[PDB]
Symmetry: C3
């Protein structure tokens, strides 16, 4: 029951979205610093392999869409 | 009178809190290591600048309180 | 009154699982690069101390199990 629980539940999800967005921004800056460092060691791909291409996708729009849906279907 | 969708949602949110707090602590340890490495290069902030002071906030209290609130609706 | 929401909640959680799974992988790769760079300076543990022995755990199974339980505790 309690379909007004939705705002609370989605506020929790919105807080997680803020947290993961910050984690993403920060971890990418760490890679930026690492890339600089490995430039004279052969470059990041030389050290990590094709794994150097892995980047965290920004799921923000899909998450906000699902949050909106919960509110909409309460 | 069986609303427990929130019960399990709450538990799922708690697992995610544990997982994200771990990512934050680990990513920050990575920056610490990076700061050491960039010392003789002028420091991290002279390589990242308009981004270097960025650190993930700890949203634990905010998330925990929101979860306690949801739990508090029954 | 409506379990489209129980499906939507599970769906937002799955989005967050993919998002955090990507962050964990990327972050661990950043540490891999950092471990390589710190090798000549005594090793990561020499620089970070016992904190060097921590890694984010993979909560995939734990989270997927909770997500399923939600669909079943429908
Ligand atoms: Cl990182």
């Amino acid at each position: 029951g309690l379909r007004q629980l939705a705002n609370e539940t989605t506020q929790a999800l919105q807080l997680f979205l803020r947290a993961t967005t910050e984690l993403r921004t920060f971890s990418i800056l760490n890679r930026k610093a690492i890339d600089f460092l490995l430039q004279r060691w052969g470059g990041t791909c030389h050290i990590l392999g094709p794994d150097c291409a892995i980047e965290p996708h920004d799921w923000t729009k899909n998450i906000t869409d699902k949050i909106d849906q919960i509110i909409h279907d309460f």
